[model samples]
Target chain A: AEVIDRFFKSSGAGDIETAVECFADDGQWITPDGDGLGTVHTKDQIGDLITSMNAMREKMIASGVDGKFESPIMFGENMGLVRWTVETDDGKVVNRGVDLFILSDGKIVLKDVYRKVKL
Target chain B: SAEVIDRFFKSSGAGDIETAVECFADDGQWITPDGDGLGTVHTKDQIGDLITSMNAMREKMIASGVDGKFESPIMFGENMGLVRWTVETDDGKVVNRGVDLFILSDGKIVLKDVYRKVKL
Candidate 1:
């Protein structure tokens, strides 16, 4: 779907607002730890979460440049995880990580899933 | 005996490390298919580890604004009991529910195979 594609693309460019709109007002998002790194998702309380996550990513991007992106399909209603690299000022890759997602009715149900750089 | 099932929840709910430690058999084990611990077969000592780990987890879940309770299972016999329950997280955000089919004998839980789901 265009919505899923757009979300990862915006995510690659680190766009958060575009991602949040994809979710229904009552949709849900869950990760491995179930609200461990972020809040447990619900329609009523995820907008700020969406924007804050975007702002954090944009803030961290040293150059505001295009990132190498790989988004994979996952279980649960067009769900998927986005993968990419967090590069340093010298363009040297410093960390590798993953972001979980959810999609419903042509838009992202949840976004801005950030976690520490796991080894 | 019902005391065995009582001990099961006693070890879990009270966080009594000693009583919790005494609930498993020499070769008894638990396998969690729902979380990261999935596929990891925890044994007598690992059960102890899980018990210790659950103590902290209990705190974390409570801090996640936890609300829930334990209801006694209907004992089917000396071997099986149906344990069912629900839990709330994020101020009634998550209604995670599940059921356990306990296999026991000689006053110790041999296996507690469970099945559960989240509402869609």
Candidate 2:
């Protein structure tokens, strides 16, 4: 839980390097659309994805997009779940979703992302 | 709490609404995903209604030769838990996949928040 908390904190602060450091050497990042971003494997790929995400976050912040974790993170065993939202500065929520985390030896081994989509 | 969650899923999946509803606290809340925005909250009777709807969908799916199942390794924390599940056809084609996040209180579910993957 401490490792995951640090990962989210680093991510929220745009510290891509520290965020990447939270993953294991053979970590996996499974996105909702596996075909789009696909499942990222290995620490290098995780770093690349985190860097890209940080860049996007910076761009969104420049445009007044405020992204936040919506509630306290819930943890069980070596896994955790956290809800998140991306909203405009005017207070309109543009996107909401949840991330499932699995840790191994104090490092993230799997981070599965699931986003709510229109039916 | 873990036992309560297990009972809830077992009862709900079996279409036993009464047993399933009993797993939640009187003031429990169920938050379901709505489009791409924040979820919609359902409580008490509304939770039963949602469970009823889910059972109906399950029946329809079963009739259509699709058997959905909750995948293993359901994890639990002190007062929270997580489960990943999927709905699929006999040939193994996945129709839907999702995860449920639960918050329990005093041996009953206080909240069950759902998030799923859907094509736009």
Candidate 3:
């Protein structure tokens, strides 16, 4: 629970390092390509890659990633959703998506995230 | 209220064609993966077709010996629900599980944003 909470803090709050720390050392995540769980990036390898991802976001935030997490949602087991808002440096809402976290013990073991980047 | 969804799954469950018919408007619309509907914008004949088609599918499920768990979770508002269910063909030739987004209006379903999970 705290793991997801912390991850959102790092990502949504512009703390890339802390956001990436929410994953387990070797956790995995999948991002569906569409509304239905049809086509997806099933079980991608993001072993604490949120920082790298955050680094990417930080670049956008500096430019203009002015989005917000609509809500922090709790999911099955030890998981949660951070519906974040993102924008480009140009001040446009660059992209929007949800982040899923799998918390093992007290740390984030893996992340199955989507739309941290605008397409 | 539960009243809205109470007869929803049941209408489909009982194969009550008339009851199912009662749930729609003269021009009620159905947005399936394949576009379908018969409401304020459609002719009476089209409306008949929509209801009849759904009835046929219901019969097909039973004829195929379909069985599985179908549950609905309410969200955002009582008017909206997400449905998850498992399906099987009588011959065990096909098994499909799915999730559907159900949007209700005026105490009846007006939109069925269905989501199905299948693999290649």
Candidate 4:
């Protein structure tokens, strides 16, 4: 779970370089929605979104939104799953998502995210 | 620890859903990353329904002279595992390539969340 831990911390911190470093150069980030942002090829392509999400997180927290990562950091030989949640000010959970990673050589080659609804 | 999940994939790849479903607990859960059933969580019986569709996919592939294969599973600590797989035509055109994450309890799987690569 080290790579996974690094990814969460680094990405959550908006440390784009370190976050992207956790992935293979040709790594991919796949989303379940299969829309415009569905399959992101290469760390370069995924980095932009990581940066964007960090900025988004900053705005949420600044606006008094309570957001935090969730549990069940499930793992398998070359894979790991990270879950997260974001709660509204009224205490309603608005976002619940899971990211599943396929790892190799200490780097994620495939990072797939699934959510309950379209973003 | 890993054998439980390895066998599930093996059984499923071989079109033996009954044997494969036996790897899960009575109330085990299944989650898929994409496709028509995307993001819906299923209990054991519901997951069994999902297996019927999977088994049908395998049957159609085999009837068309193709096959599905899963690589050996890798274990993460205990109780969790991962595997990569591909469904391909006889001439090697990949229909799908994906990975699965499994959570186990007492040698039975309690959860399996799968992800497949899809492009818009």
> In TM-score terms, which candidate is top?
2
lDDT of 3 by residue, A3-91 (tens): 66665566655665554455555555554333323333222334234445557766766765555666555544554556554555565
Mark the regions of model 1 whose C-alpha exceeds 4 Å error after superposition.
A1-119, B35-38, B89-94, B118-120
lDDT of 1 by residue, B1-120 (tens): 557778778767777767775677777766553433123457767777787787788788787688655568756445556565667765555465544546666777777654344232
Q: What is the lDDT of every predicted structure here? A: 0.58, 0.77, 0.52, 0.73
Q: Which DockQ value does candidate 1 get?
A: 0.02
lDDT for position A88 in model 4: 76
Weakest 10 consecutive residues, lDDT, candidate 1 chain A? A110-119
DockQ of 3: 0.09
- Flag regions of model 2 displaced more than 4 Å: A9-15, A35-41, A70-77
Of the two candidates 1 and 3, the one with more favorable DockQ, higher being better, is 3
For residues B21-107, what per-residue lDDT tens digits would candidate 2 score against the true structure?
Answer: 889899998888564467788887787788889788878879989986775436465687777777788888877777787788898
Docking class of 3: incorrect
Best candidate, lDDT? 2
Which of the two candidates, 3 or 4, achieves a greater lDDT against the reference? 4
In candidate 1, what are the lDDT values of residues A37-79, reduced to their tens digit?
3346665555565566567767676455433556554433454
